[PDB]
Amino acid sequence: SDRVAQLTVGNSSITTQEAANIVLAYGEWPEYCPDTDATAVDKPTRPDVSVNRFYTLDSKMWQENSTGWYWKFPDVLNKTGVFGQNAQFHYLYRSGFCLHVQCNASKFHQGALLVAVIPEFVIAGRGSNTKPNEAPHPGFTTTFPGTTGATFHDPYVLDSGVPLSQALIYPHQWVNLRTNNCATVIVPYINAVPFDSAINHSNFGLVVVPVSPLKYSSGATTAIPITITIAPLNSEFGGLRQAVSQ
Amino acid sequence: DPVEDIIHRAISGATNVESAADTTPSSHRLETGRVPALQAA
């Protein structure tokens, strides 16, 4: 009863047998911006079914030595779908996301992944240089990896210089191969401003880090893909202009 | 009374406004002879 579940948004639907409940981040639902909180005076557009729906990205193959991956959400969807086209033609953006991570495996496999939504996730430079002018900075494509995602060098600090053990202070869910085959989290829109640009700013990141490694026996299936599905939810756009993708 | 001709406002007013002005929702208009855009400087 609680294990089984089905979502639906737009024309897309997801069904799960073995799922464990659902995480609603910070106890609030996504909403449209209220009149009091609004600032920009133009009438925002609310596409609904054309934008809000599940989008599936390419799959990551999880291997015994895998170090984990991450994504930036008002990034991955900027070049894909109708959501991506509204984002390039509009200067202002607001929405929440419903997030779903999926990893199958047999009852003979063992391991655990930590799925976490970590707002304002800022990757850092890796090096001992204390001089600000010569200090390393983490690339463009490492900061906004796009649809393909990026992988951690040293997941223990989350590339942020911050302990992964405390990452449970963020909306998070475990996917444990013996318990559940998927993790689901709904994130309301959070930021210091009512709207914000989609192409410049990344509200929050996602982190799938293999805490307990992947282990199995000879003869079992070796290839274990990981797939993420994200639904932009309760979207808004404003500030229409010509397309700027970068 | 013996001679008649010896027998003989502003524009706006100030409103107290505590906060900046608000904005009210509007929609498209298509009709004639109503044109807020055209002004005479």
Q: What 3 state SS string does A173-209 have?
A: EEEECCCCCEEEEEECCCCCCCCECCCCCCCEEEEEE
**CB atoms < 10 A from the CB of A20, how many?**
19
Write the CATH number for A243: 2.60.120.20
Instruction: Provide the 3-class DSSP secondary structure of residue A61.
Output: strand
User: In Å, how far from its chain's centre is CA A15?
Assistant: 19
Residue A46 in tokens? 């609310």
Provide the resolution (angstroms): 2.8
The residue type at A245: S
Alpha helices in chain A (DSSP H): 73-76, 81-89
- The range of the structural domain enclosing residue A125 comes to 1-246
Distance CA(A46)–CA(A170), nearest Å, equals: 29
* β pairing state of A182-187 and A23-24: parallel
Distance CA(A75)–CA(A199), nearest Å, equals: 7
Burial A173-205 (b: 16+ CB within 10 A, else e): bbbbbeebbbbbbbbbbeeeebbbebbeebbbb
Evaluate whether A240 touches A74 at the Cβ level (below 8 Å).
no
Evaluate whether A221 touches A104 at the Cβ level (below 8 Å).
no
Alpha-carbon separation of residue A165 from A97, A158, A211, B16 (angstroms)? 25, 10, 10, 57
Number of domains making up chain A? 1
Name the nearest CA neighbour of A14 among A49, A53, A47.
A53
Evaluate whether A189 touches A37 at the Cβ level (below 8 Å).
no
Instruction: Provide the 3-class DSSP secondary structure of residue A84.
Output: helix
Breaks (C-N over 2.5 A) in chain B follow: 8
Sign of CA dihedral A89, A94, A98, A99: positive
Cα-flanking dihedrals φ and ψ of residue B22, to 5°? -90, -170
